Amino acid sequence: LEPGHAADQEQAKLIRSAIEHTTLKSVTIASEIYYDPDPRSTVIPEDEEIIQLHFSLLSFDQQSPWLLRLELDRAAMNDKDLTMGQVGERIKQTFKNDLFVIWSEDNDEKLIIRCRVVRPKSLDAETEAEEDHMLKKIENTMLENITLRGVENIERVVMMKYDRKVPSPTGEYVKEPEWVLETDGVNLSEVMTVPGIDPTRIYTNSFIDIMEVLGIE
């Protein structure tokens, strides 16, 4: 960590959230595809209250009737510092305006996000035949190719409290504890640049990546 923020447990938690690669596969309980004939009211009875805020907030005349729902895990919102808004805005910016996305609130008993593909104005006599397969292909690249937060090639980050020896102001060497982030996987060029860490003390087990990033000495 940063030397002025070495003992801050919550700041190390923020760094762990900032560097650990979290995708939708680690958070989603299930992925389902439904047929809702109109994008005004859903046919599923459990998310009636979810749609009726977001549909009233707003386009819908050029949306596909196929709906992609993802149900997420409450515990996955707990171990990883994630909320519905961050995931929703990340999915929105990955797919731009080509996929209209709404999400349930964090206080809802069911963590449901809903997605619809916007259709063009051109007539398509054969695209709707494979529209289910296209939505399945969108759902496939949705699960693993979307990084919610963190940098790539980082499997998981664990948090140790090591005991370094620091010169005391009286002159002695005291065993000052420090919160240290151990990591699985190496992305040393990217992990070094994030704020809140000490980039002068970052060490990597892979000395090959040290030479490529820091130098031969």
């Binding site: 299930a30 599923i44 009737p65 529209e131 289910d132 699960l143």
Partner: protein
């Protein structure tokens, strides 16, 4: 997801968009068979799974001599004697929760307290 097959040639049915009614209808790709979908759900994919944990429960599961016996209370018929086993799904991240099969009424009950 309840896969459905054609009643004429026994091939599986696939959803079709129609502009006459805008409803969900399942179509056979072989003999042009049409039928009405009983559910809007056309595809489901679970990343965490809760089926297969009780796989292998049969009418004579208690005839297995290798299965351990417990003295737990069956909450359907109040019988002490029963067999038990762990979750049968072989995922690395599965829990160690025990499933108990009563040998008097063949009822499955778990030792999970988080669920209960």
């Amino acid at each position: 997801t309840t896969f459905r097959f054609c009643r004429d040639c026994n091939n599986m049915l696939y959803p079709r968009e129609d502009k006459e009614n805008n409803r969900l209808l399942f179509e056979c790709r072989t003999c042009s068979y049409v039928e009405e979908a009983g559910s809007p759900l056309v595809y489901r994919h679970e990343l965490i799974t809760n089926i297969g944990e009780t796989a292998g429960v049969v009418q004579d599961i208690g005839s297995d001599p290798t299965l351990p016996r417990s003295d737990r209370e069956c909450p359907k018929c109040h019988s002490r004697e029963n067999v038990f086993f762990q979750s049968q799904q072989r995922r690395k991240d599965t829990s160690m929760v025990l499933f108990f099969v009563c040998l008097s009424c063949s009822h499955i009950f778990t030792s999970d307290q988080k669920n209960k």
